[PDB]
């Protein structure tokens, strides 16, 4: 029984699974987890990059000494839940503390052969269609004292985001309550009398200062400024559909559940928080935090 890195297999190409799984709590066992050095995140990042490359493969043609853009059937449905599964000689430990911060000892640890159905959703700033936290909202970071270290936020009440083509719609009441919850959670870690400020991303490139995602085969970039303009009838976010063009090859509506956020802290008596992150390893890490791989 020791920590190890190995290639998990996948299940729903991937192998069948779950006509009847089995979770099993290991009694009297406490296990140390570290969501920030979990090689499952690296494996899933690589798998998602390969998934996108393979989805782009049928849009090229190898005619002569080059690859040319070609047919491309647009509606390429990507997100179906996948499960990562330990191979022979290994086992996946799963934390069950509903408020686990990701870095520390879990007192209620079960053992599994496969993870839950994880939806590979590529999105920025907002985490959509993910898992929810029981009871309380959770905030997780390697080092809260260290700004520019991404802050992963898991809610307990999801927020419906209904987008059409081109804008998105969020209820002001639900989002107001969500922001209040996040503000109190941040006050817990940064100071009680400290005031929380939500402001727009502090970058410049319009590709990262927006909430971007895939809405029915087309990629949307939405100005999310109306969500981060607060200090502690219906919000319509303006959006633009951008076409992905691969540089080196020669020549509508959807509803989602907002289940998480990615924030970055500034760096007085207050604290400014801005939507950040961008790296998708934090997107996958927001779901693989309560797992680890061990060798028996």
């Amino acid at each position, epitope marked *: 029984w020791k920590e190890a890195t190995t290639t998990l297999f996948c299940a729903s190409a991937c192998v069948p699974t779950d006509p009847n799984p089995q979770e099993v709590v290991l009694v009297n066992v406490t296990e140390n987890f570290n969501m920030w050095k979990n090689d499952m995140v690296e494996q899933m990042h690589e798998d998602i990059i390969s998934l*996108w490359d393979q989805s782009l493969k049928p849009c090229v043609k190898l005619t002569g000494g080059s690859v040319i853009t070609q047919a491309c059937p647009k509606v390429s449905f990507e997100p179906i839940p996948i499960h990562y599964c330990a191979p022979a000689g290994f086992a996946i430990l799963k934390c069950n503390n509903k408020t686990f911060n990701g870095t520390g000892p879990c007192t209620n640890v079960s053992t599994v052969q496969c993870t839950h159905g994880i939806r590979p959703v590529v999105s920025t700033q907002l985490l959509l269609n993910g898992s929810l936290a029981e009871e309380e909202v959770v905030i997780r970071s390697v080092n809260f004292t260290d700004n520019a270290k991404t802050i992963i936020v898991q809610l307990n009440t999801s927020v419906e985001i209904n987008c059409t083509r081109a804008h998105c719609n969020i209820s002001r009441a639900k989002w107001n309550n969500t922001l209040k919850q996040i503000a109190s959670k941040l006050r817990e870690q940064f100071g009680n009398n400290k005031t929380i400020i939500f402001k727009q991303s502090s970058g410049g490139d319009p590709e990262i200062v927006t909430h971007s995602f895939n809405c029915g085969g087309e990629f949307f970039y939405c100005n999310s400024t109306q969500l981060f303009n607060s200090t502690w009838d219906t919000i319509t976010l303006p959006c633009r559909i951008k076409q992905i063009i691969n540089m080196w090859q020669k020549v509508i509506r959807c509803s989602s559940n907002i289940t998480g956020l990615l924030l970055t802290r500034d760096g007085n008596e207050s604290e400014i928080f801005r939507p950040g992150g961008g790296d998708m390893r934090d997107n996958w890490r927001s779901e693989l935090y309560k797992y680890k791989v061990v060798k028996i």
Partner: nanobody
């Protein structure tokens, strides 16, 4: 996978010009956006410029008017022409490429050192 090679950096004087090159190799037909970051010892990263598949570009305000990012298809290269160079441009520059449809970059080079004196 993808391999990026940065080159071009060196010593010049204030008001001189440089041309950084990022050569691209491997499974490159999934890149939809490349760019140049720069970092000086003791400071945070800085996305200075980026080009996308549709040839649209972005530059930070500090380099708007002095820097130009462009693409050489016949050479699989991305060029960053730096003009009116100022001492505030001294850093290690890395070229980066994105192989996911959105998000931050996925592939990075080894970096090249740009220094300028006054």
């Amino acid at each position: 996978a993808v391999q990026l090679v940065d080159s071009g950096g060196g010593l010049v004087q204030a008001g001189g010009s440089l041309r950084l090159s990022c050569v691209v190799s491997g499974s490159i037909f999934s890149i939809n956006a490349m760019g140049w970051y720069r970092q000086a010892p003791g400071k945070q990263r800085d996305l200075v410029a980026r080009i996308s598949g549709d040839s649209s570009t972005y530059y930070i305000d500090s380099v708007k008017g002095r820097f130009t990012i462009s693409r050489d298809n016949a050479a699989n290269t991305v060029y960053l022409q730096m003009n009116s160079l100022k001492p505030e441009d001294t850093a290690v520059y890395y070229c980066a490429a994105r192989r996911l449809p959105i998000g931050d970059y996925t592939d990075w080079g080894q970096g090249t050192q740009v220094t300028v004196s006054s």
